[PDB]
Design a protein around this ligand. Structure first.
Ligand SMILES: [Ca+2]
Ligand SMILES: [Ca+2]
Length: 109
């Protein structure tokens, strides 16, 4: 599970920094949660958890629920946050974040 890939302490702090609606900053969240300490293969393992339905893509529903993929206590993303995150991650413009797109988003954080 996520707390086997990332530390629960780091997840707690990361989620806790973004409790207010509209606060989410993907670069800062990825830093805080420990994604900037992970190998390329472990970044992909995190993706696969976030891809809740195992389609190979983080669709809009899974994107709005992204924080819940890290902690089930978390809020849904706000509308502003989902729009800016999708735009940041969806480089090919198809409305979803795929494997490489997620890896790139993390690498650049
Ligand atoms: Ca999916
Ligand atoms: Ca895409």
């Amino acid at each position: 599970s996520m707390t086997d890939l990332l530390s629960a302490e780091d997840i707690k702090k990361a989620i806790g920094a973004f409790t207010a609606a509209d606060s989410f900053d993907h670069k800062k969240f990825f830093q805080m949660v420990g994604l900037k300490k992970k190998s390329a293969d472990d970044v992909k393992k995190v993706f696969h958890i976030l891809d809740k339905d195992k389609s190979g893509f983080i669709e809009e529903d899974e994107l709005g629920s992204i924080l819940k993929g890290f902690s089930s206590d978390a809020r849904d993303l706000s509308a502003k946050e989902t729009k800016t995150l999708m735009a940041a991650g969806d480089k090919d413009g198809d409305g979803k974040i795929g494997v490489e797109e997620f890896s790139t988003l993390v690498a650049e954080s």
